[PDB]
Amino acid sequence: QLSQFKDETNPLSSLRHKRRISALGPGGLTRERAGFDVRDVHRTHYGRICPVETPEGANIGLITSLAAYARVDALGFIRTPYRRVKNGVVTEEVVYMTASEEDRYTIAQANTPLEGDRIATDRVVARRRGEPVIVAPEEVEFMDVSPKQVFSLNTNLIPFLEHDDANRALMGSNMQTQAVPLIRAQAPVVMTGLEERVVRDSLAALYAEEDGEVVKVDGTRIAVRYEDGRLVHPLRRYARSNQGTAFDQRPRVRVGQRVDLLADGPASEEGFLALGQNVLVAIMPFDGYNFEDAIVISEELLKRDFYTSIHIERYEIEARDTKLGPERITRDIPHLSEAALRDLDEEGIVRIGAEVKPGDILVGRTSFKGEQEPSPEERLLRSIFGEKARDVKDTSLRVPPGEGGIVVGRLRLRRGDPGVELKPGVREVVRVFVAQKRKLQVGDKLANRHGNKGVVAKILPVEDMPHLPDGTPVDVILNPLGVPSRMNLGQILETHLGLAGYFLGQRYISPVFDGATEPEIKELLAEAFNLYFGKRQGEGFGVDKREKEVLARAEKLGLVSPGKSPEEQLKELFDLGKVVLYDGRTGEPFEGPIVVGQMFIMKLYHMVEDKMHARSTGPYSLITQQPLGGKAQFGGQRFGEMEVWALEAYGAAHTLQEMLTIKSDDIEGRNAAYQAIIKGEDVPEPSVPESFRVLVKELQALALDVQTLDEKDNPVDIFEGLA
Amino acid sequence: ETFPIEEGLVLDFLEYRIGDPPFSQDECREKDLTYQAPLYARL
Amino acid sequence: KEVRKVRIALASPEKIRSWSYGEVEKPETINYRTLKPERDGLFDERIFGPIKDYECACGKYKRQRFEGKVCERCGVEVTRSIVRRYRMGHIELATPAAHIWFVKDVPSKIGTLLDLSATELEQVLYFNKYIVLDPKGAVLDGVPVEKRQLLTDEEDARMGAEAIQELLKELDLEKLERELLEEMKHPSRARRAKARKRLEVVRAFLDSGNRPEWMILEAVPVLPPDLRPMVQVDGGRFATSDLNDLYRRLINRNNRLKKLLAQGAPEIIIRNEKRMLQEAVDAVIDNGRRGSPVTNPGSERPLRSLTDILSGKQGRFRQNLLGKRVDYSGRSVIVVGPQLKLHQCGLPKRMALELFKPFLLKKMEEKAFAPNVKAARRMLERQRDIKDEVWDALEEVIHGKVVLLNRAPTLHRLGIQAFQPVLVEGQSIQLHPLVCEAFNADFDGDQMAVHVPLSSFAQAEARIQMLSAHNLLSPASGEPLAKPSRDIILGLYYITQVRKEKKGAGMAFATPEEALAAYERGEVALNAPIVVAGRETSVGRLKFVFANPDEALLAVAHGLLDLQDVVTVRYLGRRLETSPGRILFARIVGEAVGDEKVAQELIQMDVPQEKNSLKDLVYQAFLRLGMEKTARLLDALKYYGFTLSTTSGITIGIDDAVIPEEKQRYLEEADRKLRQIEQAYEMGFLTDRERYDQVIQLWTETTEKVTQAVFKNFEENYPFNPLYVMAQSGARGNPQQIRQLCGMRGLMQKPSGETFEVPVRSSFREGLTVLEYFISSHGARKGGADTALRTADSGYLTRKLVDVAHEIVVREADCGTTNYISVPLFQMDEVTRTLRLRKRSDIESGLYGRVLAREVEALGRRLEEGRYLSLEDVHFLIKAAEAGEVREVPVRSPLTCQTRYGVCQKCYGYDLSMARPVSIGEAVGVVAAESIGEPGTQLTMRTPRVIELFEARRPKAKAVISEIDGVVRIEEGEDRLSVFVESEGFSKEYKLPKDARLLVKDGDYVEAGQPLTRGAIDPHQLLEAKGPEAVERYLVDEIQKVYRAQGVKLHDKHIEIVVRQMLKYVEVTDPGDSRLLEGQVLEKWDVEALNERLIAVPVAWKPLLMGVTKSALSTKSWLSAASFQNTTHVLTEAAIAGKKDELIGLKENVILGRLIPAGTGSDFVRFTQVVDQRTLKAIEEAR
Amino acid sequence: AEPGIDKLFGMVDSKYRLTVVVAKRAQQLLRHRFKNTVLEPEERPKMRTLEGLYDDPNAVTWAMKELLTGRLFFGENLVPEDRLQKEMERLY
Ligand SMILES: [Mg+2]
Ligand SMILES: [Zn+2]
Ligand SMILES: [Zn+2]
């Protein structure tokens, strides 16, 4: 259990696991949805040495993660958060120290503030203070030592993480758990240099050692060093992840420099833990193609293949060997002989660099096998055309339901071999690899860092969009309502301050419960406007009918102050609100001081091409006599209970029954169907259950009986018994 | 803490020795085999 | 023929062999060390032993066979079991056994006198000292006492468990005795039972065939289910089954017995063995004792012995009864976005295809495409990018037809609907907004299956009932549903809200001045005055009731008027004040139905705004209009429903959240007050707990004020501009979510049950002081536990509901029954020991559309007895009410209507949803429980009170009732604050401990004795101290109380079409004929049995109240049932008595692959119709 | 919703009973030889899709709309469920 096959998705996530921490497992504190007690229990607590925004909602609480400053020296028994004592000394006698209270990083000035009301803490409550008195050490321990100390790590990494509901963040401090190597990466305009770690200590990218000076070939490997002599350097080559990530390691350098990094990471940029792609964005709605809670992409978001990735699925295919039929892999596939094969596959294995689509043989094979011998009329054909007969049921691999892709390679194996630890009684264990240059069609989840799950609506083809007065359209939207007004947050400061990016030209570091505030953005929004407005004012224009007009309402609206020419006013709008904007639809303006600002877009794991299973009869399973079968397909779809009810809630007799009838387990009924329609018009057969027919005997197992008793007592029907 | 499993007839537990992984890393991922590292212990 | 009544029950060992027919015994070699299959003993293919060269003789014809070696044209290659039943014979002849004889003391235990050790003998260790022959130590008798050695003091009489099989064909004729003999043991009291249950015991048998063939001599296991073999991929293969290795246990023993006795194994041994079989039998049966883990010793898993699996719950039974599977099913993501809304649906080209693959081929037949369907799929291969004209065809499979659409989870029939189809591009499936709500599941990229009914008689049996444009408008529960939830509101909302930006209040003399002049500065759309007007002038914009007020729209068309409520003078029916910021409204909603004429009335313009009055407009359009428009209309608030919100937008900015510059003042204040408050307790006055309640009760109240503030600065300064506003008034957003946003929000409480000192240091435009985003977390996460508990506890409450109610249908229409039941109209409020007037909703959803009782004289208009009170009418009484001619309006619902056969027409007020009274047939049974299909999530297991009662469980404490009434009696004392009652006849001691201390000087029938002012104690004593009088109520309103503090738009019908159940049962009282002085029989049957039979003798019953679950179990049938706690136990007393189990019982049919007697299948509709005049004029001359 | 749907639900004894009738005079209808419905001229619905047109093979809708021509009755009429095929010759 606990083993939780590592979730090495991104470089981070993984790490968290190495932490997470749970009272679940084999130790007694255990199962889902309570024993005797679990609801009133593992609630919150009295331990700040832990974030309170990481669980989820199901087996909640019983899962989280430790925090940064926590567990050093004696972690061996009971957690111990670091503590500050005014100067160059430190203590952390466990998360038990509840004697003498502590301060909470606020106000200061070279060892001593002046609050006069030390925002300190006793046990749990939060008494006003009582400045212990002497800068001479804390009241036996007092100082957040730093803000972030309160949260794990999977937390202290979100922008104004001091401006949203807890549960918003939560539904975020777990989204990050699911990223995607967009290869392009970016490292957020906003953020906390903790990324100085994130990568490194998780060893995503690489590192170094004392001396310096490169040389290299780049290609795959990397130069060396000078100190302890030369030293080659492997890397990755995409490689397999435990779910798809497919982690690569392109690098950086050229000649000689040793600080101290070395070659990128999967989802990374110059040591700055990059995870997503911070393109522009802007609140507001549009044809509601963002109802409830949706996002709207701009095809240009494909042009520059910004959003895309890769996933590697290992395909395990075998051939044991009974004693009746011996399974092997000659590229001489029977019955079906075509260029469709011999050209690509050939000699079994298929050369690297081959494009593949659904049903495309992956490792063709044979198998002697004679299960259903010679047919009747069929013989009228085996010759009619003269393809004689076959002797080795096609048995092949053929790509699953669907997975058009490439080939990073193959791989062969076999018995008696010294290193081949195959399952006894077998030989061969073909294991070809395929990855897929992903993309972003219409459905994948986007979501940001403060809680806002996307759900692509209808990506737009440039022409449309919000055309900034200077061409630049809004690559991304994200209409309010849903979680903004609702389940509140802050982020936004990740929009405004944002624009002070595509424009102002700088990126920023925004700590937690410290720095980055409502006035900050202003002083920043400053030079920004003068700048932007600058260009145009010295480039061509300054104030236009449209760009101006709006400003009108801007006033009547209850915003702009009736001042100087359109300059001053047009400014303000900036600062917080966003400059004008028009509309690639009609072309009019967007009556209202809209908002805009490059921010952050993630595009989590829950894609689509991976989370979908469509089909028909396909399955057809045995013993169960109910769908779930196919050496090709493999879907399902339960209707189990509820789904039922709601249906009978009306009179879908022929439809309700229809389920449990033909489209379920009428066996004959099954064929009666396909045949029925296949043939043509006709209310496919009435019905005959089965799973029940089962229960009957299944029941009769014991001393029971099931006179499928008929009408007026004496008719007595026991139907099923042969037919 | 594991009494020398009783029945003369008396076993003894003395010292360990490990490391020496029979299958260095990567190899294993090319196939399987945990990067296990065998040991022993004089008895 | 055609199925019907489903018989079952026993099949005496004599029978075993019947089905057993033959085949069995021998060993069970689960294959050979070699050629895997067969073994010539176990799952051996009947008469298949390598090369039997026979058996094929039994078969008449059909095909050849007999191939000597290997195998012939037998089943082994084809038709092997064919999933059919195949009985094994078992060689079993050894001593005795026991088919579990259940866990209720039957098939033994009772039928003698035995138990607590009726297995001290049956499981060999004692003896059922049968045999008459003068004993010694004190006579013999005929029942266990041979404590071993004793049955050796004489050295019949045997420990052997064959004794049950002994007195078998024995106490069988004496069954004509037990019938007689026993019952004759009358009165004395207490002991009155046993014999009671004993009755049935015998009474189940008798002229109901069967025998005590419960003793066993031939277990009978099949073989098919097991012979499953090698499974590869990923990382493991090898393959085997269970029940077999479980089975084995048996035969081996039953085999080793015989050969280990024949060789003379004297005493001791013999039993100790034999019994093995016994134990070995409790194998295939039920592993319920010590266990039989695999891996033996093996400290592990449980042998799948019909326990936890097969027959059990959620393994096979709970699985294949409903947990079935469509076959054209599938799934996909989730979208949205204007289309044609309703009947329209996303669906992706490809993805689709398959679902329709069948016919697809078909059409491709005669009509080009291809020749023989033979190919067909041959062209659908390896994604050979079909496209070409094919697509141009699939829409001939599509076109007109429709499909479904479900959701995970599902707590509303709305849960499906089903839309017609069309198709855009790419994967992921789109859907129309509104429906969104009917799933209360946002767009976190979720998925939704899209099954597809195939049968023509299912499609019509769909769209015309399933089409998203039908059972989604006004839905069950009460109010409507297909309304424009979030967003759309704002989109229009905006186009309204006056705007009065206030500029002044100068003056005028009718336009010359002011009006003219003022247009230079100072003043505008304000108040002004020229004689009696304000400033709606300048622009006249006129017309006539034609096709365009023209100006207006065309006026703003240019850089003129502001579409947003600017205010010009309209002209439509007559001089309109309104602006285009509202006239437009009409026009669209007008263009929907036609001639704005109507719109006019309906709509509200003298207070547009829009929000919670939209439900209405649509909802009112209904009654007066009718679906075929509701769509168009509700489907216009789509197009424009968005464009407005579009070509206007309304962002949000860190700024936008406006701090109330009238804030830092209020705050400061309080604290001060506090300052002393503290520098008070700190001196010497008021215990801590005092000031405690204080400090809190200071912000407990300071808050609301801060709250008040912001919610105005907005509505004066920055009316709509503060988009963070019209998002809470009504459109999409909560109120105490803004004050949280901008205000302060800081009452915040601890973990267990106490409140925090300090509060939240908001100004959420500024950070929090750690502790803040801490204590906040404290409270925050608890929400989380409540949400996952509800969603995970729903697993106990909804299923039971769904169950206890089930057969509830409604054929026929006119069971004209008496005893009406006036719906309460005024409730005693225990805050006001007088009388309020109810929120005017409970009434609504408590009378909304009903079937009046006895005349409704009042306010001049007379409302005839027996009438469907239209919403329009509830008002007629609602508003009316006041006067005082009606305080308890009458009508009939389910609290009466002696027809457990269903629920009959017109007894279920109106029919909630479709404008009309209960349509005919309707299986309300569903909707019934499916009424509580929006609760779950919304509630609180975390105490849960929605059942403490629902299951008649004597609540926690309850604060016991007042047995009867009469004399006050207020006896003061030491520590026993026990007050009582009496009145010259009798009574008792009512002790009210150190709890409630509220007196009273009168009487009252059962009130409450005053301790539990809320929820009477266990009705388990109320009914007793009253009757179904006030026990079919209390709860009924005592329930809602758990919904009336969490929105809830339901009541009336629903929750009251459930109760009936819970009490229906009865406990017979001294009758004649149908016996069972104790009994528990069903309701309505009693009537019939106290009717048809009436024409004699008595049957005097006695109202009886159970719980709900207990209600669900043991019902008119045997078929359904099960599905619960005591799986075996019900099947127990199931067999025995022939139990034919009626039929009418949907859940029944379903399972049994029989049509569901309801909706469009029940008795009421077998109807015909076809006839084209000359066709009907064909048999009109051909007959 | 359904074309004229409002003229249905009521013009019967109750919902289902309607839907019911419908899906019968459908197979029976088109499925028993396309040329069978009561409609005469062009009042017979069509499908002017791509370039070409044709009667919607979705029979089901004819009946709906067929219940708008005074023709056709519904109820316990002519007990010979078989004889419903008595026409199964007069229409071949
Ligand atoms: Mg979710
Ligand atoms: Zn043979
Ligand atoms: Zn009735």
CSV table of N, CA and C in Angstrom, one decimal, chain A residues 57 162 283-288 293 316 358 558 591 594-595 613-617 639-641 646 649-652 654-655 663-664 689 701 703-711, chain C residues 3-11 220 234 322-328 330-331 337 355 382 413 443 458 461 642 646 648-651 718 721 767 788 926-927 1153 1159-1160:
chain,number,residue,atom,x,y,z
A,57,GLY,N,-10.4,15.7,0.4
A,57,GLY,CA,-11.8,15.7,0.8
A,57,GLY,C,-12.4,14.3,1.1
A,162,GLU,N,-1.6,34.7,0.4
A,162,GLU,CA,-2.0,35.3,1.6
A,162,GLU,C,-3.2,36.1,1.2
A,283,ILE,N,-9.7,38.9,-17.2
A,283,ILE,CA,-11.0,38.7,-16.7
A,283,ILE,C,-12.1,39.2,-17.6
A,284,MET,N,-13.3,38.8,-17.5
A,284,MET,CA,-14.4,39.2,-18.3
A,284,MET,C,-15.0,38.0,-19.0
A,285,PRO,N,-16.2,38.1,-19.6
A,285,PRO,CA,-16.8,37.0,-20.3
A,285,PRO,C,-16.8,37.2,-21.8
A,286,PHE,N,-17.2,36.2,-22.5
A,286,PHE,CA,-17.3,36.3,-24.0
A,286,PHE,C,-18.2,35.1,-24.4
A,287,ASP,N,-19.3,35.5,-25.0
A,287,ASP,CA,-20.3,34.4,-25.5
A,287,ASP,C,-20.3,33.3,-24.5
A,288,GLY,N,-20.2,33.6,-23.2
A,288,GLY,CA,-20.2,32.6,-22.2
A,288,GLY,C,-19.4,31.4,-22.5
A,293,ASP,N,-17.3,27.7,-15.2
A,293,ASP,CA,-15.9,27.8,-14.9
A,293,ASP,C,-15.2,27.2,-16.0
A,316,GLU,N,3.9,-3.9,-22.9
A,316,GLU,CA,4.4,-5.2,-22.6
A,316,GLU,C,3.5,-6.3,-23.3
A,358,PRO,N,-3.8,4.1,-34.6
A,358,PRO,CA,-4.7,3.0,-34.0
A,358,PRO,C,-4.6,1.7,-34.8
A,558,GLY,N,-18.2,55.2,-12.1
A,558,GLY,CA,-17.8,55.3,-10.7
A,558,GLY,C,-16.3,54.9,-10.6
A,591,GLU,N,-16.7,48.6,-23.7
A,591,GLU,CA,-17.3,49.5,-22.7
A,591,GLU,C,-17.1,49.0,-21.3
A,594,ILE,N,-11.8,47.1,-18.6
A,594,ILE,CA,-11.5,45.7,-18.5
A,594,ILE,C,-10.2,45.4,-17.7
A,595,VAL,N,-9.8,44.2,-17.5
A,595,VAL,CA,-8.6,43.9,-16.8
A,595,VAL,C,-7.7,42.9,-17.6
A,613,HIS,N,-13.1,6.8,-23.3
A,613,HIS,CA,-13.3,5.4,-23.8
A,613,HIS,C,-14.6,5.3,-24.5
A,614,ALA,N,-14.7,5.4,-25.8
A,614,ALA,CA,-15.9,5.3,-26.5
A,614,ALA,C,-16.0,3.9,-27.2
A,615,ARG,N,-17.2,3.4,-27.4
A,615,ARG,CA,-17.3,2.1,-28.1
A,615,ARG,C,-18.8,1.6,-28.2
A,616,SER,N,-18.9,0.4,-28.8
A,616,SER,CA,-20.1,-0.3,-29.0
A,616,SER,C,-20.0,-1.6,-28.3
A,617,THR,N,-20.5,-2.6,-29.0
A,617,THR,CA,-20.5,-4.0,-28.4
A,617,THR,C,-19.1,-4.3,-27.9
A,639,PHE,N,-23.9,1.5,-15.2
A,639,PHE,CA,-25.3,2.1,-15.2
A,639,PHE,C,-25.8,1.7,-13.8
A,640,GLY,N,-25.0,0.9,-13.1
A,640,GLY,CA,-25.3,0.4,-11.8
A,640,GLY,C,-26.1,1.3,-10.8
A,641,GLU,N,-27.3,0.9,-10.5
A,641,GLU,CA,-28.2,1.6,-9.6
A,641,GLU,C,-28.4,3.1,-10.0
A,646,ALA,N,-33.4,7.1,-11.6
A,646,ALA,CA,-33.7,8.3,-12.4
A,646,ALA,C,-34.3,8.0,-13.8
A,649,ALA,N,-37.8,6.8,-13.4
A,649,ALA,CA,-38.5,8.0,-12.9
A,649,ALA,C,-39.5,8.4,-14.0
A,650,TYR,N,-39.3,7.9,-15.2
A,650,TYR,CA,-40.2,8.2,-16.3
A,650,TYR,C,-40.5,6.8,-16.8
A,651,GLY,N,-41.2,6.7,-18.0
A,651,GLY,CA,-41.5,5.4,-18.5
A,651,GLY,C,-40.7,5.0,-19.7
A,652,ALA,N,-39.4,4.8,-19.4
A,652,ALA,CA,-38.5,4.3,-20.4
A,652,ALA,C,-38.4,2.8,-20.4
A,654,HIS,N,-39.2,0.1,-22.4
A,654,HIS,CA,-38.4,-0.5,-23.5
A,654,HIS,C,-37.0,0.0,-23.6
A,655,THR,N,-36.7,1.1,-22.8
A,655,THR,CA,-35.4,1.6,-22.8
A,655,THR,C,-34.7,1.1,-21.5
A,663,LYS,N,-28.7,-4.8,-25.0
A,663,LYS,CA,-27.5,-4.1,-24.7
A,663,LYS,C,-26.9,-4.4,-23.4
A,664,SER,N,-27.1,-5.6,-22.9
A,664,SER,CA,-26.5,-6.0,-21.5
A,664,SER,C,-26.1,-7.4,-21.3
A,689,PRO,N,-33.3,-12.3,-20.0
A,689,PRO,CA,-32.2,-12.0,-19.1
A,689,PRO,C,-31.0,-12.9,-19.2
A,701,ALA,N,-27.9,-23.4,-6.3
A,701,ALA,CA,-26.7,-23.9,-5.8
A,701,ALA,C,-27.1,-24.6,-4.5
A,703,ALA,N,-30.0,-25.5,-1.5
A,703,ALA,CA,-31.3,-26.2,-1.6
A,703,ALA,C,-32.5,-25.4,-2.0
A,704,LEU,N,-32.4,-24.5,-3.0
A,704,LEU,CA,-33.5,-23.8,-3.4
A,704,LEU,C,-34.0,-24.3,-4.8
A,705,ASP,N,-35.0,-23.5,-5.3
A,705,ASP,CA,-35.6,-23.8,-6.6
A,705,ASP,C,-36.1,-22.5,-7.2
A,706,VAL,N,-36.5,-22.5,-8.4
A,706,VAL,CA,-37.0,-21.3,-9.0
A,706,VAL,C,-38.1,-21.5,-10.0
A,707,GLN,N,-39.1,-22.2,-9.7
A,707,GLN,CA,-40.2,-22.4,-10.6
A,707,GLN,C,-40.5,-21.1,-11.2
A,708,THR,N,-40.0,-20.8,-12.4
A,708,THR,CA,-40.3,-19.6,-13.1
A,708,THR,C,-41.8,-19.6,-13.3
A,709,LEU,N,-42.5,-19.9,-12.2
A,709,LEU,CA,-44.0,-20.0,-12.2
A,709,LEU,C,-44.7,-19.2,-13.2
A,710,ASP,N,-45.7,-19.8,-13.9
A,710,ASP,CA,-46.4,-19.1,-14.9
A,710,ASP,C,-47.8,-18.7,-14.6
A,711,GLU,N,-48.3,-17.6,-15.2
A,711,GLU,CA,-49.6,-17.0,-15.1
A,711,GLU,C,-50.5,-17.4,-13.9
C,3,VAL,N,-43.3,-15.7,-18.9
C,3,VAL,CA,-43.1,-15.6,-17.4
C,3,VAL,C,-44.2,-15.0,-16.7
C,4,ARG,N,-44.2,-15.2,-15.3
C,4,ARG,CA,-45.2,-14.6,-14.4
C,4,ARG,C,-44.7,-15.0,-13.0
C,5,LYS,N,-45.7,-15.0,-12.1
C,5,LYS,CA,-45.4,-15.3,-10.7
C,5,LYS,C,-44.1,-16.1,-10.6
C,6,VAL,N,-43.2,-15.7,-9.7
C,6,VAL,CA,-41.9,-16.4,-9.6
C,6,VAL,C,-41.8,-17.3,-8.4
C,7,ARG,N,-42.0,-18.6,-8.6
C,7,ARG,CA,-41.9,-19.5,-7.5
C,7,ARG,C,-40.4,-19.8,-7.1
C,8,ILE,N,-40.3,-20.5,-5.9
C,8,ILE,CA,-39.0,-20.8,-5.4
C,8,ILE,C,-39.1,-21.8,-4.2
C,9,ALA,N,-38.4,-21.5,-3.1
C,9,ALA,CA,-38.4,-22.3,-1.9
C,9,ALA,C,-37.7,-23.7,-2.1
C,10,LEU,N,-37.8,-24.4,-1.0
C,10,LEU,CA,-37.1,-25.7,-0.9
C,10,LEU,C,-37.1,-26.6,-2.2
C,11,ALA,N,-36.7,-27.9,-2.0
C,11,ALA,CA,-36.6,-28.9,-3.0
C,11,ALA,C,-35.9,-30.1,-2.3
C,220,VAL,N,-25.1,-29.6,-3.6
C,220,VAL,CA,-25.2,-29.7,-5.1
C,220,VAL,C,-24.5,-28.5,-5.8
C,234,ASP,N,1.6,-6.4,-18.8
C,234,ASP,CA,2.3,-5.5,-17.9
C,234,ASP,C,3.5,-6.3,-17.2
C,322,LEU,N,-28.7,-4.1,-10.9
C,322,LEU,CA,-28.7,-2.8,-11.4
C,322,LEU,C,-27.3,-2.4,-11.9
C,323,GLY,N,-26.3,-2.9,-11.2
C,323,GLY,CA,-24.9,-2.6,-11.6
C,323,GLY,C,-24.5,-3.2,-12.9
C,324,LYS,N,-25.5,-3.3,-13.9
C,324,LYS,CA,-25.2,-3.9,-15.2
C,324,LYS,C,-24.3,-3.1,-16.0
C,325,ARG,N,-24.5,-3.1,-17.3
C,325,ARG,CA,-23.7,-2.4,-18.3
C,325,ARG,C,-24.4,-2.2,-19.6
C,326,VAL,N,-24.4,-1.0,-20.2
C,326,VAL,CA,-25.0,-0.8,-21.5
C,326,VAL,C,-23.9,-1.5,-22.4
C,327,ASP,N,-24.0,-1.2,-23.7
C,327,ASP,CA,-23.0,-1.8,-24.5
C,327,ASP,C,-22.6,-0.8,-25.6
C,328,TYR,N,-23.4,0.3,-25.7
C,328,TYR,CA,-23.1,1.3,-26.7
C,328,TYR,C,-22.8,2.5,-25.9
C,330,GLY,N,-20.2,4.6,-23.1
C,330,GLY,CA,-19.0,5.4,-23.4
C,330,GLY,C,-19.0,6.6,-22.5
C,331,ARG,N,-18.0,7.5,-22.7
C,331,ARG,CA,-17.8,8.7,-22.0
C,331,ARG,C,-17.1,9.7,-22.7
C,337,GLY,N,-21.4,26.1,-24.5
C,337,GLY,CA,-21.3,27.2,-25.5
C,337,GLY,C,-22.4,27.2,-26.4
C,355,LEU,N,-20.9,4.6,-31.8
C,355,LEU,CA,-22.2,4.4,-31.2
C,355,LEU,C,-23.3,4.1,-32.2
C,382,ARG,N,-8.4,0.9,-39.2
C,382,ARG,CA,-7.3,1.8,-38.7
C,382,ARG,C,-7.4,3.3,-39.0
C,413,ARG,N,-33.3,12.6,-11.2
C,413,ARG,CA,-33.6,12.0,-12.5
C,413,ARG,C,-33.2,13.0,-13.6
C,443,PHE,N,-17.4,22.8,-13.9
C,443,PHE,CA,-16.6,22.3,-15.0
C,443,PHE,C,-15.1,22.1,-14.7
C,458,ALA,N,-38.0,2.6,-27.8
C,458,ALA,CA,-37.4,3.2,-26.7
C,458,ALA,C,-37.1,4.6,-26.9
C,461,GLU,N,-39.9,6.4,-26.6
C,461,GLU,CA,-40.0,6.2,-25.2
C,461,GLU,C,-38.9,6.9,-24.6
C,642,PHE,N,-25.9,36.1,-23.5
C,642,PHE,CA,-24.5,36.2,-23.3
C,642,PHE,C,-23.9,37.5,-24.0
C,646,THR,N,-21.3,40.1,-22.8
C,646,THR,CA,-20.2,40.1,-23.7
C,646,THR,C,-19.8,41.5,-24.1
C,648,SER,N,-19.9,44.2,-23.2
C,648,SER,CA,-20.0,45.1,-22.1
C,648,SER,C,-19.0,44.6,-21.1
C,649,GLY,N,-18.8,43.3,-20.9
C,649,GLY,CA,-17.9,42.8,-20.0
C,649,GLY,C,-18.2,43.4,-18.6
C,650,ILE,N,-17.2,43.3,-17.7
C,650,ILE,CA,-17.3,43.8,-16.4
C,650,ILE,C,-16.2,43.0,-15.6
C,651,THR,N,-15.0,43.3,-15.8
C,651,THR,CA,-13.9,42.6,-15.1
C,651,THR,C,-13.9,42.6,-13.6
C,718,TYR,N,-20.8,53.9,-6.7
C,718,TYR,CA,-20.5,52.8,-7.5
C,718,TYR,C,-21.7,51.8,-7.5
C,721,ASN,N,-21.1,49.4,-11.1
C,721,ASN,CA,-19.6,49.3,-11.4
C,721,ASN,C,-18.9,48.3,-10.5
C,767,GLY,N,-2.4,41.0,3.6
C,767,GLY,CA,-2.2,39.7,4.2
C,767,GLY,C,-2.9,39.5,5.5
C,788,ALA,N,-17.3,15.7,2.6
C,788,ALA,CA,-17.0,14.3,2.2
C,788,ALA,C,-17.8,13.2,3.0
C,926,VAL,N,-40.6,6.3,-7.8
C,926,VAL,CA,-39.3,6.8,-8.1
C,926,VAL,C,-39.2,8.3,-7.5
C,927,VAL,N,-39.6,9.2,-8.3
C,927,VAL,CA,-39.6,10.6,-7.9
C,927,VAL,C,-39.7,10.7,-6.4
C,1153,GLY,N,-35.5,-9.5,-16.0
C,1153,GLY,CA,-35.7,-9.1,-17.4
C,1153,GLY,C,-37.1,-9.0,-17.9
C,1159,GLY,N,-44.8,3.6,-15.9
C,1159,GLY,CA,-44.5,4.5,-17.0
C,1159,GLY,C,-45.3,4.2,-18.3
C,1160,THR,N,-44.7,3.4,-19.1
C,1160,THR,CA,-45.4,3.1,-20.4
C,1160,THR,C,-45.4,1.5,-20.5
